């Protein structure tokens, strides 16, 4: 697990849930039942930069807007 994810130089925190890794990819899950979803901009919120969080990790946070606009 990791407390936050870095994307575009910004720190992303979960709205509800924890970040988990299955060995090769990272997902967001709810805390009481294992049910992974992809980490998006609708699942998370932004606060601060990736210089203050200890243990923050690099990953991709997917924006739904751009693949709709091709």
């Amino acid at each position: 697990t990791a407390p936050a994810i870095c994307h575009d130089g910004k720190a992303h925190f979960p709205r509800e849930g924890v970040f988990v890794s299955n060995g090769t990819h990272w997902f967001v899950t709810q805390r009481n039942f294992y049910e992974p979803q992809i980490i998006t901009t609708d699942n998370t919120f932004v606060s601060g930069n990736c210089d203050v969080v200890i243990g923050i990790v690099n990953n991709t946070v997917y924006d739904p807007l751009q693949p709709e606009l091709d």
Binding site: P3, A4, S47, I54
Partner: protein
């Protein structure tokens, strides 16, 4: 300290402590980023207290 409040409802589930304290702030109305950007201050204040 190692399992939070999970051992009282079943099996003890490990979770790192910094992340336990962030959950505990959420439970009182404080966002979790307030802890993670001030982690050193809260640890210093707790240890002196």
């Amino acid at each position: 300290i190692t399992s939070g409040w999970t051992f009282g409802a079943g099996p003890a589930l490990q979770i790192p402590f910094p992340m336990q304290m962030a959950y505990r702030f959420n439970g009182i109305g404080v966002t979790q980023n307030v802890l993670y950007e001030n982690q050193k201050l809260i640890a210093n204040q707790f240890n002196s207290a």
